[PDB]
Amino acid sequence: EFLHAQEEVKRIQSIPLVIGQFLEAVDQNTAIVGSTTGSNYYVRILSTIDRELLKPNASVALHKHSNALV
Amino acid sequence: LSSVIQNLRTDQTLKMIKILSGEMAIELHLQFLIRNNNTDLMILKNTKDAVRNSVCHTATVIANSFMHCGTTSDQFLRDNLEWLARATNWAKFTATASLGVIHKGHEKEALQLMATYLPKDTSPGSAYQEGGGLYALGLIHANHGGDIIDYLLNQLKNASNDIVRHGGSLGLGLAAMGTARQDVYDLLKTNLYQDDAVTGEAAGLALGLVMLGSKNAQAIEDMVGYAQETQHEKILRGLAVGIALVMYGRMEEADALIESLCRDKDPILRRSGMYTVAMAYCGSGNNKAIRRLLHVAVSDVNDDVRRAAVESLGFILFRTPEQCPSVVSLLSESYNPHVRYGAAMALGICCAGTGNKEAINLLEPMTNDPVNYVRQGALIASALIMIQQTEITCPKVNQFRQLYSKVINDKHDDVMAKFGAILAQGILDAGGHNVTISLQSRTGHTHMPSVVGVLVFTQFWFWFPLSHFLSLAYTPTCVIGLNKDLKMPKVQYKSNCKPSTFAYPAPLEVP
Amino acid sequence: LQSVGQIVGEVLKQLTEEKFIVKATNGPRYVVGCRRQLDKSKLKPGTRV
Amino acid sequence: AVQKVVVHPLVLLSVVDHFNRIGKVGNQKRVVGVLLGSWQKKVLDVSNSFAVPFDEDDKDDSVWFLDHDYLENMYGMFKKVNARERIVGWYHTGPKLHKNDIAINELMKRYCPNSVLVIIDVKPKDLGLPTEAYISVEEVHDDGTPTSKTFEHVTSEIGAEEAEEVGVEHLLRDIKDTTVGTLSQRITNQVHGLKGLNSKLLDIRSYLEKVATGKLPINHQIIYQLQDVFNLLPDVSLQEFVKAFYLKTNDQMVVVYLASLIRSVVALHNLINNKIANRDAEKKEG
Amino acid sequence: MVLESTMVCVDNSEYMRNGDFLPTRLQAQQDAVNIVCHSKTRSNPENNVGLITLANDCEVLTTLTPDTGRILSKLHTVQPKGKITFCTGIRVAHLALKHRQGKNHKMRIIAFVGSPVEDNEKDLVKLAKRLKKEKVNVDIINFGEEEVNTEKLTAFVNTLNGKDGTGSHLVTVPPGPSLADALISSPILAG
Amino acid sequence: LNAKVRLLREELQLLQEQGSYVGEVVRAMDKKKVLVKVHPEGKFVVDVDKN
Amino acid sequence: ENSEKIKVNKTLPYLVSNVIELLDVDPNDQEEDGANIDLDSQRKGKCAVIKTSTRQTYFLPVIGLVDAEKLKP
Amino acid sequence: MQIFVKTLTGKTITLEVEPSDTIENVKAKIQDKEGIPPDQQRLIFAGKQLEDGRTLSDYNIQRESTLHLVLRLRGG
Amino acid sequence: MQIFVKTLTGKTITLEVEPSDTIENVKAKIQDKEGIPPDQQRLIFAGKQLEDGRTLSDYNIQRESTLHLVLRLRGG
Amino acid sequence: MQIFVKTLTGKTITLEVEPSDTIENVKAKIQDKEGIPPDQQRLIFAGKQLEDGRTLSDYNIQRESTLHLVLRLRGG
Amino acid sequence: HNMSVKAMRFPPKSYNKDLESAEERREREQQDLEFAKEM
Amino acid sequence: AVDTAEQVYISSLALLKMLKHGRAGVPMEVMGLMLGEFVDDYTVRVIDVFAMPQSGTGVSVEAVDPVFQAKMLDMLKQTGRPEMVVGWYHSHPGFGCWLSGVDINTQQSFEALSERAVAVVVDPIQSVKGKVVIDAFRLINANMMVLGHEPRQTTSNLGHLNKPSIQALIHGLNRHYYSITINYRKNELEQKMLLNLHKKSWMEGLTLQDYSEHCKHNESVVKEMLELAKNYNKAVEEEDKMTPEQLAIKNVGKQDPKRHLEEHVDVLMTSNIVQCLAAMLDTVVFK
Fold it and tell me: Which segments of the protein form a coiled coil according to its record (chains H, I, J)?
């Protein structure tokens, strides 16, 4: 059952997304980012993202409206 | 009894039959419940005024009928009639049906009684009305059969239209239950075969009652064949219960039928397998039923199978109430709410009559579950258990009493949740606090009509006007001393302990 | 009257068979999917779209 | 010509719908239809289909009916709503070849010079695969028998599209699957292998009965092939091949030993974390 | 008025090249077809017609079509060849009549016979009887040489429409002027 | 394990909510008010939460 | 009615903007039905590219209520 | 080979048929003997719904079977 | 030997077979006795569904064993 | 005269008309009968579209002919 | 491995059992979303 | 009055065709027509669906040939599909699911022509392997509802199992219409197919992998183990030296060697086991 619901949350990785830059993570499941529109944000991240690949200044993609790491 | 009466008849004997067939006991119970009547109408007045016109309207005129069960106290519906007239369509049917529960067992001259609240009060049709009338005449005689049967049978034949047949087959399949009268089985099967989607549900259920527990080589084929090859759904949702009643305690005998139904592709037959393995093993506590009846809950792929599979456990264990919380208490934390609802009902139904503490301990935190219908389930279950208790007889009662009130008063809450609370108000005060639920006779024999009562009741999920089927389960709690002439002596008794433990809940009708 | 303009922009790279990165001329970058018939062989990095 | 053919699920569901519907027009035991598709680099792709009226008088060959100018009309009506696809071949749902279908093929070939036959048996009675592919050829003979016009086999498979497998998976709520990893290997590639191989050898077994005067030896060809089979099968596992086998088994298992050792050490480490954490916090909270 | 489906089963055997009728039997029949189908459609506009031909195999040329021209331009370039085969033709026309577009139509077969028929009589009697219970009506023109086939056909039609059915005919003709001119318009409206 | 599946199921709804800005405080005012300036805009004088 | 329906559209709060380019357009090589666009293929005249004051740049597939002859960059 | 038909009105109709007949034919016989249009008739035999294109012996209907007619009402 | 097979209605059949007998002969003789078409049926013993190619001895079936017949009642 | 017009739903309508009537009058009668607006509905006869500008005689609409009605299908 | 995972992995204790979430939170959120809806 | 419980049964084939057609008009609201029958007052069943010739402009579409529809439909009957029209469907990419503006108008005339019509809307671009987004609607009454009448009757829990989304509330679903629950009812034969749909031939199962190349893979992973063991020693040494969560929070860049060490097991295992087993079997079954 866990495998069945595991990928069910990639409705969020839909096609139209904004590109932003990664800054730093407060605590796991939350971080701060700077969008290409120029304004910074403090936002939630999604769980299934592997944490061993986000490093200082790596281009990530954010939800268009909610502004959440995806 | 129907057998032994023949060996007895072939004088005092001519009146002894009046005890053997129950004629006395019924009217003694009636006289007790009418005299000892005691209710505070203020609660109804409140919930009435809190009604903002909605589904919730119906829940009053069902619930009211619970608290006046057996007692002929019409005087709540006799007045405030204009608000009652606001009902319409199918709901009107249910309102008329409640006129049964208030008169339950008021056997004699019933015919003129309902003809004072006629099926043709204006000869209107409104055939929700008249079908109601038949459903009431079925409920008065709920297990007495007798001279009414040959009336209702005729009255089914000449039904104009397909709602009258619905009430008719329900009433007839109610009164004549257990008898296996072959003419009745013929008439019901021919109406089932007519294959109309509303009547075939009523008839498909009733068909199961008149064969109750008498396993029958032929009829099970004549109905599983039909169920296995028809396209309307309601017909299947009727038959899925209609099958199981052909087994009753038959222990190992039914197992062949079981292995058929549980293999089926069709989800509703796969379900009805579970009801069968519940009714086949009541009270036995046999591990061999549990080991599979629970395995279905953990893996099957369609939710109503999971709910019915979990909820059935409430019947296997009811002879040892201590056990159920030891197994369900974990399962109540499942992710998908259907299982949680089933757990609430299993728990409520295992230990229905007692004040058992751990059951309530687990039921309390469910009342805030986000998903409204499990709140409805927990409220009903909470109210079935804890029947008749006082704050001395168990603590943790008077907070529920007000919980129900506040949730019914809340202006911004789901109707489907606040249906449960308004049903619970009536459950907790049934009959005028003089009646109780039990699956268990005084001598220790399992009691049949209440078992059927609750199994049918739990289907109110699918079809509302079915809820009155709980009124089978209110056995009265009283004692009577009787003279040799069967006169009533004016004797007294005493009781050993501080009166506050027994008392009626001290009505607090401020105005 | 029943017609609408369309935004101009520039392509940076093709990511997968259906994911392209574009930069609008005005500002924010984006991730956007193609239309089926457009001969994806032709969207070299740098073409206006 | 063709090297392989690929079928999309939409065709299979279409076939089944047709098979169930016919009961409203006849009583026949077979149905026939047209395959729309496309292809490139000798890989053929079938995508869509429609069914045309057909009928046959069962008790004889050579008496059958097939409606041309309904086929042509539908092909016209389809072309108007998808230009990508063109007549490619035909399908029928019988469990076995029939005498006259070569004479069907010589008709419908007038619509496409390369036409291919797909048998889609709708009621499997075994573990297996639902499709077979055939193409028509001419055979010479060494016996001086005249030139024969006869079918030839082509390998086949199911394919997929991202816009459909979303639907397939939304619908595959029926039973268990995906017993992950080592669980799925042995089932999928030992048991369901051996069952197939056994069924094949039973089929050969049955055929070699009929040659007990029940039927004429169909050719020395088939016997030559059988003799190749029993000649080729691997040499008796009795020579220095054995030495070469032991070497690899040792090497195959040694690394397993290593990995198992790693596997245990981590459990001990996790054990210690659980132990200390417990007792400490206990005494602390006391 | 009554709606009818009609299949015309022309004959094209080798024997059709001989010259009893003036141009050659092929032109002796094409005009007859041309008039009979005009009569079928002009009788009522939604009747409809199809075409079959008898050789060493039977062959369908155009299924039930409401426009006559489709048949005419089709009937041309049919070539005299091979040997007739009667039963198989009638069977395949029975099949093709089942699949008519509108089942409220009742149905007919027309056939032109122009050669010896090598059939066993007792096969015709079976075919006729089952066609009898299937409500298909047959109607034979002994267009070509009357002899040889004179008997078998007559007994066939008897066994079919007999028992006082009366809906099915045999009609026959010597060599002479045009079939359509002298013959076909004479017996009844057609057939 | 059941708890973990519950959380994962709800994450899709939960992370649909919008985020929050980050700014630099320049100096605090009295009666619980503060003057903070955001990254691309004007200084905002604004209150504080209860905790 | 047609001229009034045009008139009632023209509410005067227009934006203002500058033409950047005029383009010659040719349909695609291939076509479809059930799903074809009036604007990708099936255009053959002139098209324009405009720069708005608020620094947008829009392509226009249909010029609108002015004859393309009289425009220039 | 006798067959009983029951309509919604309960009138009983008697049919002399053959095991290899077809539903189209019996529906037509009813049309002749009562006047109901064929295509409005739907046939019911226990649960199964009978299909026009095939024959009684395929459903192994036996002598004096009782068989129901249902009317698919139409919108208006 | 004598084996027992149970049907849902409480019918029981007793049947004569041999240890080396295969499932196909069993289904055949049940057809010959009762007339059930060989395919419409499944045989259940020990909570498992049997495979048509094996023998009874392959499933450790013993004397006077009873197994459950599963049936698609009307076939269709 | 009487004329039958039938729709993709399977419902059928009968109209009274005189040969001098135009198509527009037909559509107006349909709207009166059912409430569909006159601009939505398309008509078909003998496999070619109807258009206003003509009388019903002009297409040789005979007594008791059958017309097809099909709705405008727009979305956005 | 079996003995180790089998034995002293008992520290999952009832000293602290299982948790939950808030109860007014969802109410507030639903009220706010219904306010948004009305608009 | 309409019962709350009434279902829509869609028949698995129709769904696949709705998707493969919607995910092509990628940015445009393609549309089509849908065929079925009204079994009963508690049912509607859709059995098949087919496309049309149509053209649009991004902001809209509509179909251009009216004759094509009647001709196709009247053709289909000749092969056992006499069923007629019950509704229509159109695709919304990425928006969500609702009816808006024009879609109500073309809808409402159906209901004047045929009560009990149904409009379906599907979304092909949010959907993903686990689940497809479909909805089915019908219009609320043309008001006269100041009476406060409910649109429907209720006599079951059966209709209140689901939570309406915020988006449809924004566009007003319960204000102008109502949703109806979708249900699937597969028959025996198609579900027998649907499981075969992935089976792979016996030919493969008995086949061995090459022994060379296989050895190469073994040596690759074994030499990859080293670095992870070396790193693991330090990672063991240094823990509990700081506050607990500040382990993870400081380990977002560099990898943690436990997982990478562990998941190189389940590659030596599985692989070596299955290869040795398959060889060990087939050494007997052939001669």
Answer: none
- For chain H, the C-alpha Rg in angstroms (whole number) is 12
Q: Could you give the strand order of the β-sheet that contains I66-71, starting from the edge strand earlier in sequence? A: I12-16, I2-6, I66-71, I41-45, I48-49
Enclosing domain of residue E47: 3-186
Judge whether E37 and E71 are in contact, CB under 8 Å: yes
Q: Among residues 30-49 of chain J, which lie with CB inside 8 Å of chain L?
A: 34-37, 40, 42, 44, 47-49
Could you tell me which residues are beta bridge partners of residue A18? Answer: A62, C30
H75 touches L: beta carbon within 8 Å: yes
Nearest Cα to Cα of residue I26 among I43, I8, I49, I9: I43
- Interchain pair B217, I10: CB under 8 A: yes
Q: What is the DSSP secondary structure assignment for residue C48, as one 8-state letter?
A: B
From CA L163, how far away is CA E63, in angstroms rounded? 57
**H48 at I interface, C-beta within 8 A:** yes
Rounded-to-integer distance, Cα E107 and Cα E97, Å: 7
Is the dihedral angle over the CA atoms E173, E175, E177, E180 positive or is it negative?
A: positive
Taking contacts as CB-CB distances below 8 angstroms, the residues of chain L near J74 are 60-62, 102, 105-106
K28–B contact, CB cutoff 8 A: no
Kindly tell me the sign of the dihedral angle through the C-alpha atoms of B429, B435, B441, B443.
Answer: positive
Strand ordering across the sheet containing L8-10: L177-179, L131-139, L118-128, L84-91, L31-37, L45-50, L8-10, L182-184
Residue closest to B206 by CA, chosen among B237, B177, B233, B230: B177
- The experimental method is cryo-EM
**Local structure of L120: helix, strand or coil:** strand
Query: B199 and B235 in contact (C-beta within 8 Å)?
Result: no
Cβ contacts of H46 on chain I, cutoff 8 Å: 74
Contact with chain D for residue E63, Cβ under 8 A: yes
Ligand-binding annotation for L198, yes or no, is: no
The chains in contact with chain F, meaning 3 or more Cβ pairs closer than 8 Å, are: A, B
Closest CB from C1, C6, C37 relative to G59: C6
Identify which of H65, H66, I9 has the alpha carbon closest to the alpha carbon of residue B223.
I9
| Sign of the dihedral defined by the CA atoms of residues D9, D11, D14, D15, in that order | negative
| Subunit contact B416:L160, Cβ cutoff 8 A | yes
List CB contacts (< 8 A) between D82 and chain G: 32-34
Q: Which of L23, L21, L49, L55 is nearest to L36 (CA)?
A: L49
Task: Assess contact for J49 and J43: CB atoms under 8 A.
Answer: yes
**Sign, Cα dihedral of L253, L258, L263, L265:** positive
Say what the resolution is, in angstroms. 3.8
Does the beta carbon of E57 lie under 8 angstroms from any beta carbon of chain D? yes
Do the Cβ atoms of B271 and B305 come closer than 8 Å? yes
Taking the C-alpha atoms of residue B341 and residue B232, their distance in angstroms, rounded to an integer, is 27
B contacts of L158 (beta carbons < 8 Å) = 461-462
- Chains near E with 3+ CB pairs less than 8 A apart are D
**Token match 């200044």: residue?**
A57
Residues H76, J11: C-beta atoms closer than 8 Å: yes
CB within 8 Å: L24 and C3: no
How many domains does chain E fold into? 1
Q: What phi and psi, each to the nearest 5 degrees, are found at residue A47?
A: -75, -40
H55 contacts D23? CB cut-off 8 A: no
| Token pair for L127 | 């959907």
Strands (E), D127-266: 131-139, 148-154, 156-158
Q: For residue E95, give the nearest of D104, D102, D71, D28 by alpha carbon.
A: D28
Which residues have CB under 8 Å from J3's CB, separation 6+? J14, J15, J16, J17, J61, J64, J65, J67
